[PDB]
Amino acid sequence: ASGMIVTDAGADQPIVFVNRAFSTITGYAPNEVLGRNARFLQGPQTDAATVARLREAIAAARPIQERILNYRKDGQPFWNQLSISPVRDETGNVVAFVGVHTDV
Amino acid sequence: ASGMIVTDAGADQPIVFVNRAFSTITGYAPNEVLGRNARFLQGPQTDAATVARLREAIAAARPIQERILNYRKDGQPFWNQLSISPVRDETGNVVAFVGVHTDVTAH
Numbered sequence: 001a002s003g004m005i006v007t008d009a010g011a012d013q014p015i016v017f018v019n020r021a022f023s024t025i026t027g028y029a030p031n032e033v034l035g036r037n038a039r040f041l042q043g044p045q046t047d048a049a050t051v052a053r054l055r056e057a058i059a060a061a062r063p064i065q066e067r068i069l070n071y072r073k074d075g076q077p078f079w080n081q082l083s084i085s086p087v088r089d090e091t092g093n094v095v096a097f098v099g100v101h102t103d104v
Numbered sequence: 105a106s107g108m109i110v111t112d113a114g115a116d117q118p119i120v121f122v123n124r125a126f127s128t129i130t131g132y133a134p135n136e137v138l139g140r141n142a143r144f145l146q147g148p149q150t151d152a153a154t155v156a157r158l159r160e161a162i163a164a165a166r167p168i169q170e171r172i173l174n175y176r177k178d179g180q181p182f183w184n185q186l187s188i189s190p191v192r193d194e195t196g197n198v199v200a201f202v203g204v205h206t207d208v209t210a211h
């Protein structure tokens with residue numbers, strides 16, 4: 001099953017919802033991640049060039065897909081196949097971001 | 105502000121998350137809507153043709169935008185500018201639906 005993260009659109013995109021699969025994949029309970037930016041999943045061997053593309057996509061509110069090295073709660077590194085899309089109202093305002101983790 | 109509704113992909117799309125603006129617009133607290141299909145927002149003056157377009161779009165997992173007459177918890181009618189899109193993973197499976205809605209009653 002694929003993980004899903006919803007964040008607010010502004011003020012550093014705090015997590016507001018995660019699905020069951022997110023907890024299975026990352027080892028984090030919802031209470032541990034709600035209200036935080038998802039970047040806590042990144043660690044010492046995470047590729048800075050990949051993080052830069054995520055940073056610019058979020059700032060522009062455009063969709064992005066990256067393979068990024070993340071770390072489970074227990075500290076084990078895993079490859080996260082991450083796809084992020086902005087959620088917009090019909091006037092073009094960004095309401096939220098949705099992240100999907102296509103990880104086995 | 106614009107509301108957001110997140111549903112599961114299957115099993116008649118029960119609501120799993122709503123943002124604060126959803127409650128502002130509809131008068132429903134999260135407790136009152138979680139695990140339910142969003143069609144409780146519809147009522148007798150809702151356009152059945154619009155409902156059919158939503159039904160067919162969701163069944164095919166195709167994005168759709170409609171204006172639909174909905175009802176607040178207290179029964180007050182309002183015009184809902186509704187956009188629904190599937191959320192897919194990188195195998196092409198639908199993992200959720202996301203709805204964004206704006207109260208467009210005011211002229």
Ligand SMILES: Cc1cc2nc3c(=O)[nH]c(=O)nc-3n(C[C@H](O)[C@H](O)[C@H](O)COP(=O)(O)O)c2cc1C
Pocket residue numbers: 005006007013037038039041042051052054055058068070080082084097098099101
């Ligand atoms: C909805 C959403 C989900 C995200 N999921 C992840 C994730 O699973 N792993 C990850 O490393 N970063 C994820 N990010 C990216 C970080 O939150 C952050 O945007 C990025 O690391 C840029 O921040 P910087 O200023 O530290 O470079 C996600 C962002 C959003 C908006």
Ligand SMILES: Cc1cc2nc3c(=O)[nH]c(=O)nc-3n(C[C@H](O)[C@H](O)[C@H](O)COP(=O)(O)O)c2cc1C
Pocket residue numbers: 109110111117141142143145146155156158159162172174184186188201202203205
């Ligand atoms: C994510 C999501 C959000 C929805 N939001 C609304 C809404 O705000 N108002 C509404 O009338 N229907 C909404 N619907 C549609 C109903 O849940 C339902 O799909 C539609 O009424 C079809 O039922 P029928 O088969 O009897 O036509 C939403 C559906 C989804 C998947």
